[PDB]
Paper text:
Separation of cellular extracts derived from cells exposed to Api137 in a sucrose gradient reveals elevated levels of partially assembled and not fully matured precursors of the 50S subunit (pre-50S). High-resolution structures obtained by cryogenic electron microscopy demonstrate that a large proportion of pre-50S states are missing up to five proteins (uL22, bL32, uL29, bL23, and uL16) and have misfolded helices in 23S rRNA domain IV. These data suggest a second mechanism for Api137, wherein it disrupts 50S subunit assembly by inducing the formation of misfolded precursor particles potentially incapable of evolving into active ribosomes, suggesting a bactericidal mechanism.
Unexpectedly, the C_(L22)- ~ H61 precursor showed a continuous, well-defined density at the expected uL22 binding site, corresponding to RNA rather than protein. In contrast to most other precursors, H63 of domain IV was not docked in its terminal position. Tentative modeling revealed a non-canonical turn within the root of domain IV, causing H61 to thread through the gap created by the absence of both uL22 and bL32. As a result, the entire domain IV is positioned on the solvent side (back) of the subunit, preventing the docking of the respective helices in their correct positions, which renders this particle a potential dead-end state. Despite this massive misorientation of H61 and the entire domain IV, C_(L22)- ~ H61 showed structurally mature domain V helices H90-H93 located next to the PTC. While certain states exhibit similarities to previously characterized intermediates, surprisingly, nearly half of these precursors lack the early assembly protein uL22. This deficiency induces precursors not observed before, including a 180° misaligned helix (H61) within the 50S subunit, as a result of Api137-mediated assembly inhibition.
Author numbering:
A (entry chain N): 1 to 102, 104 to 120
B (entry chain D): 1 to 126, 161 to 209
RNA sequence: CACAGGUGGUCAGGUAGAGAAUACCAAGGCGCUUGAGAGAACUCGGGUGAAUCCACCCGAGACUCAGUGAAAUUGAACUCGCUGUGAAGAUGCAGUGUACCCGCGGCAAGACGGACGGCUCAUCACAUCCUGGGGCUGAAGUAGGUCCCAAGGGUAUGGCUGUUCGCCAUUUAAAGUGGUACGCGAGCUGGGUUUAGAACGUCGUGAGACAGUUCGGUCCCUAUCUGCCGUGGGCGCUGGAGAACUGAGGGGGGCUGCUCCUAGUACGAGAGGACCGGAGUGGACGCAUCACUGGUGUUCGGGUUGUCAUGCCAAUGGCACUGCCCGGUAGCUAAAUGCGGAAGAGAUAAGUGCUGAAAGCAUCUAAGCACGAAACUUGCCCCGAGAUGAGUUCUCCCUGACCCUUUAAGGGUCCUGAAGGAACGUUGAAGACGACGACGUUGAUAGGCCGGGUGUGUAAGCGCAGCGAUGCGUUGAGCUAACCGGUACUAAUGAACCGUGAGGCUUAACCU
RNA sequence: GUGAAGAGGGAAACAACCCAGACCGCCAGCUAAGGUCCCAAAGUCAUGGUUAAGUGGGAAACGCGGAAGAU
RNA sequence: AGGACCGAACCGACUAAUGUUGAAAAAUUAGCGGAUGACUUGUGGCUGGGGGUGAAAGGCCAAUCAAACCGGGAGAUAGCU
RNA sequence: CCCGGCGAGGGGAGUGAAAAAGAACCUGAAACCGUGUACGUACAAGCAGUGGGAGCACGCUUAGGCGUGUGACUGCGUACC
């Protein structure tokens, strides 16, 4: 503990944290833009980027894994058809964080979106 | 006599011909070049300042850049001092290799303990206070192998601190 | 009090279920009154934009826990130690020493915090005891009494007496003796008294009390400063600033069993029997590490019972302690060890000594003049110039102008804004909060990706066999958070604030 | 006799020890106990003596010794 | 048929802890005990203060009992701060 | 009328003798909370006061040494019932 540790404390149940991560990842892949605190945005990016990278390759196993980790038929249907080819030539950095001004001393807020988000 | 400064990279085990496992620590010892010489007449005592590593010119402060340019040497990551044993005197810009420890077989290692949170009385003494960010000196350690071309030094047992820390190796005063 | 506490009857479904019990579901109700903010009027310095009328945001002063806000207490506090006196341990009396001002996290030498009694491992003496190790006592054994690093502050029966109790008897692992208000009645309790009800009667004008009666019974509060440890904001070391060290002072530990030969040598008639501490070998404790020897590792894989869902299977996700187990990445620990408590030196009590008397002897000393015990200090590991006596060394920068007065450690205005720091982001092996290391387009600081490593175990699909289960090649496959070397694919942009503009007075030495 | 019901000065401090009974004011001088190296105001004054142990600056009985005192 | 056994609701505070200006002027949590009997509960009524009640703790009688509240005796009281 | 949020609240103009009378409304001190004026305080030990005492800004005899606020230092100083 306190040495070479990844991930904030995030005091809460592990299952609740996983459900929250899945919900935020689904929201991001659906709307391609979210407003949330910097730690939450970073956690969402960390949890979603592996899914996007896996979705780059179209296969039955990849689709099944995405469905298992997302539990949304519509979301997986959207994936492997648009996001894949859109970011096929890009390795990493599929999401960007923009500072939307302010709390400053209570909790920061920022927008998390895709590299393009359109076109 | 004089000690060098190295960087910890890792620790592993070494097997001898007879088949004995001895813990060793990976320490990279860059050639320390003397930057300043302090004498009795001016500074009041005999000493030599040693610099190791390198830093980007952007982050190097102008006073430090001027001090390094005075000695005509590249700017390093820090400065260290060692007290001479009334022996031969070095000169500014004289690079020092790791050959000195190649014929001593006994060295002492000084490092910085890794930081840790507040510890209870039982944890510390078995008085509460700050743990880590403190000196750690280990003596009576014998160098296992010395590699001049690789600048790799091995010492029996472990050494203080974690990977990437800076340690100081000095001749074993005790004898 | 919209309280967390209490309120009588009826409606009583599905699955695994003997069960209205257990776990999830049908219809229905909820995600809880702390977890989380805008730009906060106004004021300053700025850059950006069509050339008066200005518009946008940053760096700041001005709110901050998105906050109302109570709590016993409080003569006034600028609330140090030791020694002596004192209606008796003096923060306040006399003498002496130390300490920069104001905060934060823990430990209480103790504040006589505040409103009799013993149950007390942390600093104390007797064997102290929230359950480590011991040494002695011609100890018959167990056991007492004597001693060490030490304070089980929850507990026997009893004489002197009042009971746990102040002296002690049997004590076992203690039933226990005071220091500190016997550390706390800011813990407990009465177990006898002045005090929960009886209770002989008392000293006692009376109050006040009877450590005297036989049984006794219900005892309150949310760290105020202070001492120690660590860590912060301001200021000063005299122009400012960044680094590296000397050093007045201060911090804690010097434990202990065996053997090899040295040497069965010396000494010693014989018996007897070392100095040798020359080298290795154990245990208690301290620093540090995870490659090795065990655990955790609710973030990783696999197996499995019930239940809901993905329209059904295969296969998955949610719940049943992480639903129950096999493990286990990095990290954190000990159940594992590299080292340590040196060697040596100074002065030492006792003791051992070169020449040597006073007082033709003697003698450790009178004259010249030397060692030495686990005692003391260096030597081993250190911090430390807030040491105001404010140190030493190296480096970087400012080389402007004008006006006025009460004409000097003077004041004011335009411009300049150096080195350095802070402001914000990535962040860490730094972290309660501060603070500290590295980077910010002149880049691997963080996220992801590439290939590898560890872990887990034969993922799904396909065709065959078994008319079920299930197996075969696909396949040492799939997945892998924290590990390794690169990748700018993404985030740290151009920037802006403080900080200056030649540095006071007197004197000695150099060309004027 | 003091305090009780009296200030002030000295004994380092102090209520009972010594001097001393304050009507008030004035930047004046002289005494008592106690001092005249400093702290702290006053002779480092003069003569005759004891003292080598800091006895002074804490001690009984007893043959200079007796003599061991409080973080 | 069990002052029978295990085990829900339910009942008792028997034990430990939570607090002693509390969430409550005696409550809460975790175990223990009964769980067809001397059981419990909804509602209505009676037993009244030198008295009632009391499977005898002199328990309880409106958060109080070795004799409760209200107005008068009483602006009471010997002694005392 | 303006700011403010199309509220509350505030600032102007007007009425009002007076708004130093605005519905919290005559006169308006203290304990307590903030800002400005001048001073002491970051090497300095105890009932925090009493005399001496250099300065810091201002008005005075327009210096000639006085007063409005402070004491770095120094002799003394164990609050009241």
């Amino acid at each position: 503990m306190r040495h070479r540790k990844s991930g904030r404390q995030l005091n809460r149940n592990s299952s609740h944290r996983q459900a929250m991560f899945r919900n935020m990842a689904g929201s991001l892949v659906r709307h391609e833009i979210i407003k949330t605190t910097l730690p939450k945005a970073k956690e969402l990016r960390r949890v979603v980027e592996p899914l996007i990278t896996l979705a780059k390759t179209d296969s039955v196993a990849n689709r099944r894994l995405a469905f298992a980790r997302t539990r949304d038929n519509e979301i997986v249907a959207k994936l492997f058809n648009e996001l894949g080819p859109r970011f096929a030539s890009r390795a990493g950095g599929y999401t960007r964080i923009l500072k939307c001004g302010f709390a400053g001393d209570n909790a920061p807020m920022a927008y998390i979106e895709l590299v393009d988000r359109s076109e | 006599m004089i000690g060098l400064v190295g960087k910890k990279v890792g620790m592993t085990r070494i097997f001898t011909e007879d088949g004995v496992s001895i813990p060793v620590t990976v320490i990279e010892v860059e050639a320390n070049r003397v930057t300043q010489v302090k004498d009795l007449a001016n500074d009041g005592y005999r000493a030599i300042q040693v610099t190791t590593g390198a830093k980007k010119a952007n982050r190097v402060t102008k006073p430090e850049a001027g001090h390094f340019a005075k000695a005509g040497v590249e700017a390093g990551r820090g400065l260290w001092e060692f007290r001479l044993a009334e022996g031969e005197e070095f000169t500014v810009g004289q690079s020092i290799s790791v050959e000195l420890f190649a014929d001593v077989k006994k060295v002492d290692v000084t490092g910085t303990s890794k930081g840790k949170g507040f510890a209870g009385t039982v944890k510390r003494w078995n008085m509460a206070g700050q743990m880590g960010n403190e000196r750690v000196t280990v003596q009576s350690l014998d160098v296992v192998r010395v590699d001049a071309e690789r600048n790799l030094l091995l010492v029996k047992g472990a050494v203080p601190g974690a990977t990437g820390s800076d340690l100081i190796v000095k001749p074993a005063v005790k004898a």
